C-alpha cells in the first residue's frame, strides 16, 4: 500500500530539497467594452444585455454576467487558497523541525526517509521488508530490566531477498527500526494501543492482550466536509 | 525584501496581542416568491420560468436558478473555509509556543519579533542590518574547543548607520543573532546547507565548502493547486 | 545459519604475496559486505578493509592502502583479501567478518556497516618468516 | 578518520559485580559504536550492535549506553564467562576502527 513496512534509516544517498521562502480590459461607452479574441462584449445593466431573436442578447448577458461574477469569486477563493497554503507551508516547515520523516511522507504522498541538513532536507527512500515475514513479539519488557521496557513493540522481519531473520522495533507508518533503542520506564496499569499493518495490536502491562482490526477503533472525523452542491440538470419547458 | 538581513532580540517595546478564542424569505405560492428590494421574484421548477419575448421569464429563471444554486454553494463552501481557519487557528497559537517569532512573521507577512507572556504575544519590530556588511565566516567551529563547534554559521555584520563591525550567529529568516550562543558536538562527515539571502552556503565538516545559488537546491512543491477554471467567454450565435 | 569459511594458515617469506579466501555459505554473499580484520599477537583487533561484492566497492585502511587487495568472486561466493610486501609486522590472524545489516537493495547501496559485523569466519594464521 | 579510545585497558572483579567499559571518540558516532566480545584462540563475537541494541543470543547481563563522543558497555553481574577481552568499534564512517579491548579478568 501506500506505507508498507519498511527500514528507513539504512539509505546513504538522500536528495536534497528546500521549502519555497516566496510561493482585464474594459471600457465604459453604462456600456462597457470588454476585448475579446474574436470579438469584442459591451455589456449593460440597465440594458440587461451584452452585444457580441432579442433574447440572444440577453442569453449572452446573462451567461457574460455569470461568468463574470464567477471568475471574480475564483479569483477571490484562489487568492485566499494561495495566502492559506504559504501558511500551511510555514506549517510543514516548523513540522519538519519537529519530525522530517511523517510530514516528507505527506508530502510525497508516498514513504520516504528524510533528515534535516542545515536549512534543506535529505530525502531518501526506505527498503521495503517482507510483509509475511514481519512479526510483532508478545513481550514489550527489556531483558534483565524490570524498570525499563520498550516504548514500542519488537518486531522480528526479514529483508525481499534476505533468508536471515532481523530483530527490530516497530515505529509509525509500519516503519520498522533496526535500533531496539526506544524504551520507557515501566508503568503500573499501563494499555497501549500499536498500528501494525491493518491490525491494532494491544498490549496490556507491557505484554500483548489482544490483536484488533483497524475498525475495532472509531476513526476521529477530522475532514471537513464542504458538500459541494453540484448545479442541477434542469431541462427548461418551451412556453409563449 | 520581506525578510531582510535583521536582529530580533534587542526590540524593546513590543505590542501585546491575542489569539481570538472565539472566531432568506421564500413563500410557496410549486410556484416560491422571493423578495427582492425592487421586485418579487417568483420561481416555478415545472414552469422552468422565474417571474420579476417568452425567453424573458426563462432567462431570468437560468440566472435565478444558477444563482441560488451557486450562492448555496458559496455558503457551504464559507461555512468550512470557516471551520478550517478555526482550526488553523488553534495550530498557528500551538505552533506559537514551538516558535513565536516564525509562526508572528507568517501571521503579518512582515518579519517581526514576537515573545508570548503568558496567554499574549508581544510582537515587536526587528534592528535592520548593513545586508552589503553580513558576511559568513567559514569556520563553523567553537575556539579553544574541538568536541563543541558553531551548530549554525557566525556572520560578520554592521548597523544602518553604525561604522563599527558585530560578530553574531546566522539564524533562520536571515535572522543574525548577537549572541553566537548557538552550538552542537562536533560530529563526523557532518554536512550542512544553510540559506544567508539569495544564496545556500555549504559547509562540509564544519568548514565552508561552497555557496550556491538557491535554485541548485531543488524546491519542494507543498502548494495544493486548486486548478481554478475560469468560465470560458461563449459567443452565442442567433438562431431561427 | 550464515557460515564464512575461511583459508587455511600459510607461512609466507616476506616480500612475498598472501591472498586469504573466505567463502560465504547459508546467505546472500553479493548483497552483504565483508570485512577484513587483522589481529597481530598480543595485539587488539585492526580493521585493514572491507568490500561490498554487489558494487565491488572496497574501502581499505590507510596503512594498506597502497599494498592491500580485496576482491570479490560472485561464482564462488568467495571474498579474496591478498596483502603484497609483506613484512614480520604483517604475522596475525587475518579474520572476514560479514556485516550484520543487508548493505545493497537492488542496485541502492545501504549504510549496513553502521550496525558492526556479526558472522566472522575461524581466522587464517600468516606467519611472515624466512 | 575518527579516533576511538576505552577508557580501562583492564578491568579485575568479583563474580557478581558490575563492570562498565568506556570507549569515547573526537568526533560523533551519532549510536553507532559495536561493542564485540573475544576470548583467547576465539573469532570476536558481537555482543551490543548498536550503541545500546544487545544482539541476539548475548546474556542479557551484558547492556550498552551511550551516544556520540561518550560511549559505554555494563555487565550487571560478572561470571566465569565474561573473563574477556571487549573491544568497541565505530561503525559511523570509514575508515572503520575497533579501541584496544579491555581486558575483564575474575578478581
Known amino acids: 500500500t501506500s506505507f508498507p513496512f519498511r527500514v528507513c534509516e539504512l539509505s546513504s544517498h538522500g536528495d536534497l530539497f528546500r521549502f519555497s521562502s516566496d510561493i482585464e480590459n474594459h471600457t465604459e461607452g453604462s456600456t462597457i467594452a470588454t476585448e475579446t479574441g474574436k470579438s469584442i462584449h459591451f455589456v449593460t445593466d440597465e440594458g440587461t444585455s451584452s452585444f457580441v431573436n432579442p433574447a440572444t442578447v440577453q442569453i449572452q448577458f446573462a451567461y457574460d454576467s455569470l461568468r463574470r461574477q464567477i471568475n471574480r469569486m475564483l479569483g477571490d477563493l484562489a487568492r485566499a487558497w494561495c495566502l492559506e497554503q504559504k501558511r500551511q507551508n510555514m506549517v510543514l516547515r516548523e513540522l519538519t523541525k519537529i519530525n522530517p520523516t511523517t510530514v516528507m511522507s505527506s508530502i510525497y504522498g508516498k514513504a520516504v526517509a528524510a533528515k534535516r541538513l542545515g536549512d534543506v532536507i535529505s530525502v531518501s527512500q526506505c527498503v521495503p521488508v517482507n510483509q509475511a515475514t514481519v512479526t510483532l513479539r508478545k513481550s514489550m519488557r527489556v531483558p534483565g530490566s524490570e524498570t525499563m521496557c520498550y516504548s514500542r513493540p519488537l518486531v522480528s522481519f526479514s529483508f525481499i531477498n534476505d533468508t536471515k531473520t532481523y530483530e527490530g522495533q516497530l515505529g509509525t507508518d509500519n516503519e520498522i527500526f533496526l535500533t531496539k533503542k526506544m524504551t520507557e520506564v515501566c508503568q503500573a496499569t499501563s494499555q497501549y494501543y500499536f498500528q501494525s499493518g491493518n491490525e491494532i495490536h494491544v498490549y496490556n502491562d507491557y505484554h500483548h492482550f489482544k490483536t484488533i482490526e483497524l475498525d475495532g477503533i472509531a476513526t476521529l472525523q477530522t475532514f471537513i466536509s464542504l458538500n459541494t452542491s453540484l448545479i442541477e440538470n434542469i431541462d427548461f419547458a418551451s412556453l409563449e | 525584501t520581506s525578510f531582510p538581513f535583521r536582529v530580533c532580540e534587542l526590540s524593546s517595546h513590543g505590542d501585546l496581542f491575542r489569539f481570538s478564542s472565539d472566531i432568506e424569505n421564500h413563500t410557496e405560492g410549486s410556484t416560491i416568491a422571493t423578495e427582492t428590494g425592487k421586485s418579487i421574484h417568483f420561481v416555478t421548477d415545472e414552469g422552468t420560468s422565474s417571474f420579476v419575448n417568452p425567453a424573458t421569464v426563462q432567462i431570468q429563471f437560468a440566472y435565478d436558478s444558477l444563482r441560488r444554486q451557486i450562492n448555496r454553494m458559496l455558503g457551504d463552501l464559507a461555512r468550512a473555509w470557516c471551520l478550517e481557519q478555526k482550526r488553523q487557528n488553534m495550530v498557528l497559537r500551538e505552533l506559537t509556543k514551538i516558535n513565536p517569532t516564525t509562526v508572528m512573521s507568517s501571521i503579518y507577512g512582515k518579519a517581526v519579533a514576537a515573545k508570548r507572556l503568558g496567554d499574549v504575544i508581544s510582537v515587536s519590530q526587528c534592528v535592520p542590518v548593513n545586508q552589503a556588511t553580513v558576511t559568513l565566516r567559514k569556520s563553523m567551529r567553537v575556539p579553544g574547543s574541538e568536541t563543541m563547534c558553531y551548530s549554525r554559521p557566525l556572520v560578520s555584520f554592521s548597523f544602518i548607520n553604525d561604522t563599527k563591525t558585530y560578530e553574531g550567529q546566522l539564524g533562520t529568516d536571515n535572522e543574525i543573532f548577537l549572541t553566537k550562543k548557538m552550538t552542537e558536538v562536533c560530529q563526523a562527515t557532518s554536512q550542512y546547507y544553510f540559506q544567508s539571502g539569495n544564496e545556500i552556503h555549504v559547509y562540509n565538516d564544519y568548514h565552508h565548502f561552497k555557496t550556491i545559488e538557491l535554485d541548485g537546491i531543488a524546491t519542494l512543491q507543498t502548494f495544493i493547486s486548486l486548478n481554478t477554471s475560469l468560465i470560458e467567454n461563449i459567443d452565442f450565435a442567433s438562431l431561427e | 545459519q550464515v557460515q564464512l569459511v575461511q583459508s587455511g594458515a600459510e607461512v609466507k617469506k616476506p616480500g612475498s604475496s598472501i591472498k586469504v579466501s573466505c567463502k560465504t555459505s547459508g546467505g546472500p554473499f553479493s548483497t552483504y559486505g565483508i570485512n577484513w580484520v587483522r589481529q597481530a599477537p598480543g595485539q587488539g583487533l585492526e580493521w585493514m578493509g572491507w568490500?561490498?561484492?554487489?558494487?565491488?566497492?572496497?574501502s581499505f585502511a590507510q596503512r594498506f592502502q597502497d599494498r592491500l587487495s580485496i576482491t570479490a568472486d560472485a561464482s564462488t561466493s568467495t571474498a579474496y583479501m591478498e596483502l603484497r610486501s609483506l613484512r614480520s609486522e604483517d604475522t596475525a590472524v587475518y579474520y572476514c567478518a560479514r556485516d550484520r545489516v543487508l548493505g545493497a537493495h537492488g542496485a541502492n547501496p545501504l549504510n549496513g556497516h553502521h550496525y558492526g559485523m556479526d558472522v566472522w569466519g575461524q581466522g587464517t594464521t600468516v606467519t611472515v618468516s624466512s | 578518520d575518527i579516533q576511538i579510545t576505552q577508557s580501562p585497558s583492564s578491568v579485575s572483579a568479583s563474580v557478581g559485580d558490575r563492570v562498565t567499559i568506556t570507549c569515547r571518540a573526537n568526533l560523533g558516532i551519532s549510536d553507532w559504536l559495536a561493542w564485540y566480545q573475544q576470548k583467547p584462540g576465539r573469532a570476536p563475537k558481537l555482543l551490543i550492535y548498536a550503541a545500546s541494541s544487545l544482539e541476539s543470543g548475548v546474556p542479557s547481563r551484558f547492556s550498552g549506553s551511550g551516544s556520540g563522543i561518550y560511549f559505554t558497555l555494563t555487565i550487571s553481574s560478572l561470571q566465569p564467562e565474561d573473563v574477556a577481552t571487549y573491544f568497541c568499534?565505530?561503525?559511523?564512517?570509514?575508515?572503520?576502527?575497533f579501541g584496544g579491548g579491555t581486558r575483564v579478568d575474575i578478581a
Open positions: 568499534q565505530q561503525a559511523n564512517s570509514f575508515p572503520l576502527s
Open positions: 568490500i561490498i561484492p554487489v558494487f565491488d566497492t572496497s
